[PDB]
């Protein structure tokens, strides 16, 4: 049974743990957590969560260098340098990389030094790292590849319904705006940041920021290369995000044809990844949604027969973390 | 005309500058700023403020290493180590210590090693560092003292009315709750912190936190020694705070009498420092209040003759920062 360490026990790291915990007959078994904090934090923050609420599991410290979650002991280490992590000692097969700082080969590869045999980065990768979206191009995963990325939250929302649009109607070009919950990279009150927009008090502002997601979709769907641009607008919600996609397509169409194509994918190839919601819901209602993408069918418009607008909801933390688990399962089942 | 540098261009550092800029005929001249940031942050975050709104002055860069505010140039340097700062070089008389991290004699002393004469710390000190509340004991300030503190925001609110209450009714004992706007020590979403409560998403929670504000009043009002304790609750507002003080007094009294005493203090000895509000206002209304304490008079109570409850509002950023400027005007007017 494949052995996993979670490096960076933050929102994704902690979500990741609970997502996996919810799983039945996991091919994975998580044996270590590393973070800048200690067992004190790991235990408390796993148990109490302002976004997720209380973890329905028996969470306590075991000793001073571990915690136990329902009787399973999990080591907790605290080294900011991943080269120094006990992965060889502990027999770690695979590392979930959630710090957001080791996103290139040189960085993530420090885990490999240390003992680990593979690394899933929970962010877009820097440089020549393979990038997989589950339900889109993750069948193409090759075990020969030691360091991979599970893309961004946005790219996971967007790729799956872009896959359907291009297939079924053929995208010529398009553009994307995500209205995104604030995330830990924004300041709470105005303070220094390298990005002067992310410097700004998160919970008081609409904040345009830089996405790469519209280009990342080209990594998992090469046909879209050069065809999309987007932006992001961070707003004062703590979780759950929305994508507004506008594409010009080849095949002239109407709203319900489009929504029907999505419903069709939802029961077949994108089963478990794509959903269609026909109710008049709001962001808080997609909290803990296990789908990468949830189409708000009533907001689907087609203008002039070939300009399609699509709105899609995603739990940026939970739904993305369910996909990380899915990719780790894929990795573990394509172990040579 | 004394030469000032701002160490820590944060919420206080920039409130401090704006407060000073608003003064007429200051004996202070601001010539430098230090931050972990750069001219690019400094000029932007000074001009645009989510809490204060746009600074009505001509703010712009002026070199790779300075900014111009209203014609007057101001050097911007960037060094985490106060020893390395060029205070000798630029003729800096006094450092405003707003980093939140050089609060002892050893740390704050590096500013003097580097060539400054005086350090004013914008927080409580560690050690027996001389501490001052303007309107309470700032008159006891001696030029003999190189490193001094302006105490916490909560202590600048609390001390002035506690002074009037002890003088005119005689405080036996008492307890305090500050209901406090979130500040930058708090996380935006749950994440690691050494304080497991400050870890928690600031804009989503009521967060109790330790305050030393009650015991610190006894440094500026020794008569109050041993007699007060307190707690703080951080709430999802970005600025403006309230102190809720319950005292037992020796002199039997009644609400209106307590209030009238405050109103008399406000016209006489605590003029410009303590004010009394007789309209049903809410927190946002006390933004940019120049008073350290505004008594909310309709909230004054007296239970069983000798248990008084007083509610006081303060702008924890601007009001305190106005006090910091006053303390530095005191330092300047007593220069040797």
């Amino acid at each position: 049974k494949l052995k996993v360490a979670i490096n960076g026990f933050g929102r994704i790291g902690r979500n990741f743990l609970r997502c996996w915990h919810g799983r039945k007959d996991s091919p994975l078994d998580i044996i270590a957590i590393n973070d800048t904090g200690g067992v004190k934090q790991a235990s408390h923050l796993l148990k109490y969560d302002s976004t997720l609420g209380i973890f329905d599991a028996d969470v306590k410290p075991s000793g001073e260098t571990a915690i136990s979650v329902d009787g399973k002991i999990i080591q907790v280490v605290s080294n900011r340098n991943p080269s120094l992590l006990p992965w060889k000692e502990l027999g770690i097969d695979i590392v979930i990389e959630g710090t957001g700082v080791f996103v290139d080969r040189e960085g993530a590869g420090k885990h490999i030094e240390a003992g680990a045999k593979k690394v899933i980065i929970t962010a877009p990768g820097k440089g020549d790292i393979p990038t997989y979206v589950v339900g889109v191009n993750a069948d193409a995963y090759s075990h020969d590849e030691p360091i991979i990325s599970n893309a961004s939250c946005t790219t996971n929302c967007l790729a799956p319904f872009v896959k359907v649009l291009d297939q079924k109607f053929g995208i010529i070009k398009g553009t994307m705006t995500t209205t995104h919950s604030y995330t830990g990279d924004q300041r709470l009150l105005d303070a220094s940041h390298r990005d002067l927009r992310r410097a700004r008090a998160a919970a008081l502002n609409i904040v345009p920021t830089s996405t790469g997601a519209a280009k990342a979709v080209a990594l998992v769907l090469p046909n879209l290369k050069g065809k999309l641009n987007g932006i992001a607008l961070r707003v004062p919600t703590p979780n759950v995000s929305v994508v507004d996609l506008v594409v010009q397509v080849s095949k002239k169409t109407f709203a319900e044809e489009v929504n029907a194509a999505f419903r069709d994918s939802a029961e077949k190839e994108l089963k478990g990844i794509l959903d269609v919601c026909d109710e008049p819901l709001v962001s808080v209602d997609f909290r803990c949604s296990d789908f990468s993408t949830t189409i708000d069918s009533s907001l689907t418009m087609v203008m002039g027969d070939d300009m399609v607008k699509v709105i899609a909801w995603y739990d940026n933390e939970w739904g993305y973390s369910q996909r990380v688990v899915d990719l780790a399962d894929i990795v573990a089942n394509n172990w040579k | 005309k004394l030469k000032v540098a701002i160490n820590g261009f944060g919420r206080i550092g920039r409130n401090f500058l704006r407060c000073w800029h608003g003064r007429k005929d200051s004996p202070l001249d601001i010539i430098a700023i230090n931050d972990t940031g750069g001219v690019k942050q400094a000029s932007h975050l000074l001009k645009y403020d989510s809490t204060l709104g746009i600074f009505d002055a001509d703010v712009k860069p002026s070199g790779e290493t300075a900014i111009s505010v209203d014609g007057k140039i101001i050097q911007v340097v960037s060094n985490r180590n106060p020893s390395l700062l060029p205070w000798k070089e630029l003729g800096i008389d006094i450092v405003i210590e707003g980093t939140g991290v050089f609060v002892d004699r050893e740390g704050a002393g590096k500013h003097i090693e580097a060539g400054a004469k005086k350090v004013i710390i914008t927080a409580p000190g560690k050690g027996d560092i001389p501490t001052y509340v303007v309107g309470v004991n700032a008159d006891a300030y001696s030029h003999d003292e190189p490193i001094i503190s302006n105490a916490s925001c909560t202590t600048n609110c609390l001390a002035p009315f506690v002074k009037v209450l002890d003088q005119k009714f005689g405080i036996i004992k008492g307890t305090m709750t500050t209901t406090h706007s979130y500040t930058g020590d708090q996380r935006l979403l749950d994440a690691s912190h050494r304080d497991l409560r400050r870890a928690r998403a600031a804009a989503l929670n009521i967060v109790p936190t330790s305050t030393g504000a009650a015991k610190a009043v006894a440094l500026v009002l020794p008569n109050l020694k041993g007699k007060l304790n307190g707690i703080a609750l951080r709430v999802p507002t970005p600025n403006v705070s309230v102190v809720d003080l319950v005292v037992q007094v020796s002199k039997k009294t009644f609400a209106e009498e307590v209030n009238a005493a405050f109103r008399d203090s406000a016209e006489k000895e605590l003029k410009g420092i303590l004010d009394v509000c007789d309209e049903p206002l809410v927190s946002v209304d006390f933004r940019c209040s120049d008073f350290s304490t505004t008594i909310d008079s309709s909230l004054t109570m007296v239970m069983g003759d000798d248990m008084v409850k007083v509610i006081a509002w303060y702008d924890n950023e601007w009001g305190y920062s106005q006090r910091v400027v006053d303390l530095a005007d005191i330092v300047a007017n007593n220069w040797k």
């Binding site: 900011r80 957001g100 990279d185 303070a191 992310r198 | 960037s78």
Partner: peptide, 20 residues
């Protein structure tokens, strides 16, 4: 320039975190 240099060495800090 000054804050950028701080950030290569210290990517994980308040002044640096950039998610996407």
């Amino acid at each position: 320039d000054p804050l950028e240099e701080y950030c290569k060495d210290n990517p994980e800090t308040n002044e640096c975190r950039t998610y996407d």
